[PDB]
Design a protein around this nucleic acid. Structure first.
Ligand SMILES: [Mg+2]
Ligand SMILES: [Mg+2]
Ligand SMILES: [Mg+2]
Ligand SMILES: [Mg+2]
Ligand SMILES: [Mg+2]
Ligand SMILES: [Mg+2]
Ligand SMILES: [Mg+2]
Ligand SMILES: [Zn+2]
Lengths: 150, 129, 81, 62, 184
RNA sequence: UUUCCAACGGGGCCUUUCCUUC
């Protein structure tokens, strides 16, 4: 566990055995799919959507109430971003990492950290390349990635 | 990361009997875990095991008795040509008279005697005695 | 120890274990319905907050986040379900 | 300004073939976007007649 | 409105119950018009613990959405209006085969068309709005298999008597034994 | 030698079931 450090720490969400229900939940497939699409037009990521909707509204999970995961919804309604949002925060970080090495080159730990992050990015992409969510030949690079995330 | 789960069971098995326990909680099980334990409980080396359903891959509680010296798993599943079943029994089994090498053949998971009668061959899986 | 019923473990001991370490795992967080008597209808909230929740109309508060369960702000009521 | 153009004749033939792969790129992105848009009719039409026959084999048996 | 709701030519019970719906139909606005859109394909009759044979109604399964909205009120009038009978609502599902080697490629297969997923919707249909909160399977030292299907809490009254019919109902469909249980 | 007896394999049927196709 934890490829990129030594921590073995187990943490995660515990899914309820209940694949239907709350049943104290009312609403409807129409109600959330509209709450979903109305946030995803506001700029929110499929993670912050199920995040905000879980605490502010009742949504335990949007896959029990609606038959599809918060990403497949954004896709069929045409909100699906160019790059996955995991892969996006990675590239977004490496940018804020590399930006800091350019301003201070005397930090080697950073130079280390930048290696780990980039090592992750390139391997994630390589998967997304295999099942064709990214174009075969899609690659990360330091020049185009600063622009790519912004 | 977990590699052969068949072995992560037969291990929690071989650590219950020696420690003297009458039962164990094995995880995740499998189609093949079930069919190992089935050829096992069939010759009596264990009692009844009960598939519990987590919503993911499963657990099992196996009630075992006393009679099982070792139930082993052969990690590379070697190709056994039906001359070589003899040599697989002659190696890891305590005698000719009992004990069972359990392989996989096209005809499904079974012990090497039910192989010798049905006359099919295949990839070895493990053994029990 | 040396024989026990694993299939049918005590709910006393089962309630103490970790949420991954129960027989079939289940979450230990809950949901609740909160009131601010100024507003006549309730919002459903998640026991563990993160995002600091507000009710339907007015801008007030409900809870504030921490590591664990949401800390509800001052005079409030919570039914659980 | 770099090399890879050996003379006029090549530079043209490059340009010749660059506008040809920019059309095959345009024509395929218009025609397969005609495949998507116009199968969205056959979804709204076949979802209509199960919503039109939904009130039709309801109302007419009254 | 007699054989319309039948959705098939035969037979007798399918008529009787088809007649039974229409006797529950004209009660005017909320006791009809939400009961009319529903239909059923067929009915089968099989035995039960109470000596009262079971009446199992098949459903095309778009339609389990509305039937579930009624159900309890309906199966209360069906077991009353047709009594000495146990009335349950099953949904007809496809069950596609697992392709063989020598077999030639067909359209792929969804997993909800799979023999095992189907029998796991059968147990989900035979029981109703209580829930299924867990499962187990004992493999008896005889080599037998017996499925312990655990149920929930509230409203559970409605199937209380219906326990030993589902086991039989499901054993006429499948070839596998069922038992139930509740919390402690 | 059939009948009885169990035993061990083989094959084929029905159950929502390609074993391609006229
Ligand atoms: Mg770990
Ligand atoms: Mg590592
Ligand atoms: Mg964490
Ligand atoms: Mg495997
Ligand atoms: Mg183990
Ligand atoms: Mg399993
Ligand atoms: Mg023991
Ligand atoms: Zn408020």
């Amino acid at each position: 566990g934890r490829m990129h450090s030594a921590g073995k720490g187990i943490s995660s969400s515990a899914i309820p055995y209940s694949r239907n229900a709350p049943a104290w939940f009312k609403l409807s497939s129409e109600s959330v799919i509209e709450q979903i699409v109305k946030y995803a037009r506001k700029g929110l990521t499929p993670s912050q959507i199920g995040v905000l909707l879980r605490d502010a509204h009742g949504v335990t999970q949007a896959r029990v109430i609606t038959g599809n995961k918060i990403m497949r919804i954004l896709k069929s309604n045409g909100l699906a971003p160019e790059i996955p949002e995991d892969l996006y925060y990675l590239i977004k970080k490496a940018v804020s990492v590399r930006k800091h090495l350019e301003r201070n080159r005397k930090d080697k730990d950073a130079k280390f950290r930048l290696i780990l992050i980039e090592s992750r990015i390139h391997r994630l992409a390589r998967y997304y390349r295999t099942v064709a969510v990214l174009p075969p030949n899609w690659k990360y690079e330091s020049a185009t990635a600063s622009a790519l995330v912004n | 990361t977990r590699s052969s789960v068949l072995a992560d069971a037969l291990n929690a098995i071989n650590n219950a009997e020696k420690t003297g326990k009458r039962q164990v909680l094995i995880r995740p099980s499998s189609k093949v875990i079930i069919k190992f334990l089935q050829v096992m409980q069939k010759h009596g080396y264990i009692g009844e095991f009960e598939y519990i359903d987590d919503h993911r891959s499963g657990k099992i509680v196996v009630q075992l008795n006393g009679r099982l010296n070792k139930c082993g798993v052969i990690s590379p599943r070697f190709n056994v040509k039906i001359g070589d079943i003899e040599k697989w029994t002659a190696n890891l089994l305590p005698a000719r008279q009992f004990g069972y090498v359990i392989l996989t053949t096209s005809a499904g998971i079974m012990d090497h005697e039910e192989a010798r009668r049905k006359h099919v061959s295949g990839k070895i899986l493990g053994f029990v005695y | 120890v040396l024989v026990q019923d694993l299939l049918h473990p005590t709910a006393a001991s089962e309630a103490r274990k970790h949420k991954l370490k129960t027989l079939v795992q289940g979450p230990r967080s809950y949901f609740l319905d909160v009131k601010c008597p100024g507003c006549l209808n309730i919002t459903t909230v998640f026991s563990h907050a993160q995002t600091a929740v507000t009710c339907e109309s007015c801008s007030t508060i409900l809870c504030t986040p921490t590591g664990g369960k949401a800390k509800l702000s001052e005079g409030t009521s919570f039914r659980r379900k | 300004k770099g090399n890879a153009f050996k003379h006029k004749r090549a530079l043209v033939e490059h340009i010749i073939q660059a506008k040809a792969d920019a059309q095959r790129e345009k024509a395929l992105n218009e025609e397969a976007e005609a495949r998507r848009l116009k199968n969205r009719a056959a979804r709204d039409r076949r979802a209509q007649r199960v919503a039109e026959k939904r009130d039709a084999l309801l109302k007419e048996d009254a | 409105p007699q054989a319309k709701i039948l959705s098939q030519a035969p037979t007798e019970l399918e008529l009787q119950v088809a007649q039974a719906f229409v006797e529950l139909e004209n009660s005017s606005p909320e006791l009809k018009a939400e009961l009319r859109p529903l239909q059923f394909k067929s009915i089968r009759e099989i035995d039960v613990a109470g000596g009262k044979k079971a009446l199992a109604i098949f459903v095309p399964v778009p339609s389990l959405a509305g039937f579930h909205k009624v159900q309890t009120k309906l199966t209360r009038e069906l077991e009353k209006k047709f009594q000495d009978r146990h009335v349950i609502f099953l949904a007809e599902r496809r069950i596609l085969p697992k392709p063989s080697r020598t077999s030639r490629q067909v359209q792929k297969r969804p997993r909800s068309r799979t023999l095992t997923a189907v029998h796991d919707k059968i147990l989900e249909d035979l029981v109703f709005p209580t829930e299924i909160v867990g499962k187990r399977v004992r493999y008896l030292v005889g080599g037998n298999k017996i499925q312990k299907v655990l149920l929930d809490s509230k409203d559970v009254q409605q199937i209380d008597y219906k326990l030993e019919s589902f086991q039989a109902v499901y054993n006429k469909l499948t070839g596998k034994q069922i038992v139930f249980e509740i919390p402690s």
